Amino acid sequence: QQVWKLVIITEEILLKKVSKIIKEAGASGYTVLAAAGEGAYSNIKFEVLTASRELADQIQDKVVAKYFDDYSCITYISTVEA
Amino acid sequence: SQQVWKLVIITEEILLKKVSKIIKEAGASGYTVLAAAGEGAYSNIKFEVLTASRELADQIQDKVVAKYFDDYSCITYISTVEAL
Amino acid sequence: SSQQVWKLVIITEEILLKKVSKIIKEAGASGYTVLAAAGEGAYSNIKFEVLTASRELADQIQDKVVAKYFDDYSCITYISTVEALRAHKF
Ligand SMILES: Nc1ncnc2c1ncn2[C@@H]1O[C@@H]2COP(=O)(O)O[C@H]2[C@H]1O
Ligand SMILES: Nc1ncnc2c1ncn2[C@@H]1O[C@@H]2COP(=O)(O)O[C@H]2[C@H]1O
Ligand SMILES: Nc1ncnc2c1ncn2[C@@H]1O[C@@H]2COP(=O)(O)O[C@H]2[C@H]1O
Numbered sequence: 001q002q003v004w005k006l007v008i009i010t011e012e013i014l015l016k017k018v019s020k021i022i023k024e025a026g027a028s029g030y031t032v033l034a035a036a037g038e039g040a041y042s043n044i045k046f047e048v049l050t051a052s053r054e055l056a057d058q059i060q061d062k063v064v065a066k067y068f069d070d071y072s073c074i075t076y077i078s079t080v081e082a
Numbered sequence: 083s084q085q086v087w088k089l090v091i092i093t094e095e096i097l098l099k100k101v102s103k104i105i106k107e108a109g110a111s112g113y114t115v116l117a118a119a120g121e122g123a124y125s126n127i128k129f130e131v132l133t134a135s136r137e138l139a140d141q142i143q144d145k146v147v148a149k150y151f152d153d154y155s156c157i158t159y160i161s162t163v164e165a166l
Numbered sequence: 167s168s169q170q171v172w173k174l175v176i177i178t179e180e181i182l183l184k185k186v187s188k189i190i191k192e193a194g195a196s197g198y199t200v201l202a203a204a205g206e207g208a209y210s211n212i213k214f215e216v217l218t219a220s221r222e223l224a225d226q227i228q229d230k231v232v233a234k235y236f237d238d239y240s241c242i243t244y245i246s247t248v249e250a251l252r253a254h255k256f
Contacts, residue, residue, distance in 0.1 A: 003159070007248075009199055019121070029122030031092060038187075039197030049159065064251070074197075074256075076171065076217065076248040080090075080159040086244070102206070112207035114177055132244065163175075163244040166232070 001082045006056040008046035008063055009035060010073040015044055018063055022048055025059045039072060049080070086165045089139040091129040091146055092118065093156040098127055101146055105131055108142045122155060132165065168249040171256045174216040174224040176231055177203060178241040183212055186231055190216055193227045196256055207240050217248070219256045 008018060015032070022030045031047040050056045060075050067073060093101060098115070105113045114130045133139045143158055150156055178186060183200070190198045198216045202209040218224050228243055235241060250256055 005159075005161075023121070029120060031118050031120035031126075031128070033116055033118045033128070033201055034124075035199050035201050037197055037199040038191070041202065043199075045199065045201070049157075060251075074217070074250075074254070076173075076250045077168075078161070078246070078248045080161040082157075082159045088244075088246075106206070112205060114203050114205040114211075114213065116201055116203050116213070117209065132242070161246065163246040165242075165244045166228075 002079060003049050003051055003082050004053050004056040005078050005080050006046070006048040006050065006060055006075065007077070008048070008060070008073065008075045009043055010046070010067065011071050012042055012044050014067060014071060018046060018067070021062050021066070022046070022059055025062065026055060027059060039074065049082070084134070084165050085162055086132050086134055087136050087139040088161045088163050089129070089131040089133065089143055089158070090160070091131075091156070091158045092120070092126055093150065093154055095125045095127055097150060097154060101129060104145055105129070105142055108138065108145070110138060110142065122157065126155070132163065136160075167252060169219065169252050170247055171217050171219045171250045172221050172224045172245055173248050174218070174228055174243070174245050176214040176228070176241060176243045177205065177211055178214075178235065179239055180210050180212050182235060182239060185235075186214060189230050189234070190214065190227055193223060193230070195223065195227065207242070217256050
């Protein structure tokens, strides 16, 4: 019941593209919340729970490779108990 | 100092008052709600409830899941954090 | 391939947005995220999330906000750890 929580915080423009990467990669779902900040609720925070670290890592590695340079994004991973 | 538990519940908006009732009636210090959307559209809510005792978190959790999980789209998980 | 970073959360009334933001930046944080929130102790609270690679940085921010506002406003704070890619700077 120990799963991994992937977080992606990125510009709101990427809502469909990032949720595509999540859905296709095989995640059972995702959560998304409106967010603001610096680095106006112009961003979104993705939360993807996955049964395996490797899946979380694969989603993050694709999102980062495709979008980290041309859009402002951060991402991190933690573990939770389900 | 002091390790507390973070119970997260994600359910749809209409359970807001019934779930908050369960949290308060279980004797939690309080709770935090954020608006959220997702797939498993922004008419779901995310509860976060922090508790000194994993006991308290687990009861609140089972009582919510018993009453509503089968009939409503709903997820939950627990982690630990460091409070003051 | 991963590095430990600390995540500081502060939940306060929305009116404290400008003051708390300024305390985060003045301590040298690379950034912060804010979400709108409601709760009990409609979305008239705010949740800050501040990631940093030094627990000392997180401790300074937390100590200053607690000292300044936790008497006069209803707030909570906590800290946990997360993992980030080494390639990223926090
Ligand atoms: N794997 C997952 N990761 C993160 N959030 C999820 C996951 N599965 C379900 N959820 C959340 O739980 C909610 C249940 O109802 P919804 O499908 O409307 O929206 C869902 C998401 O917000
Ligand atoms: N035990 C708890 N778990 C989660 N959040 C809390 C808890 N106690 C207080 N809070 C949050 O702290 C906030 C302080 O102001 P409010 O009472 O408006 O709303 C409160 C909640 O958002
Ligand atoms: N150190 C940090 N802690 C928390 N959030 C951050 C940090 N750095 C950047 N962010 C978030 O990542 C977002 C990236 O785009 P923005 O610059 O619009 O706003 C940023 C913040 O919301």
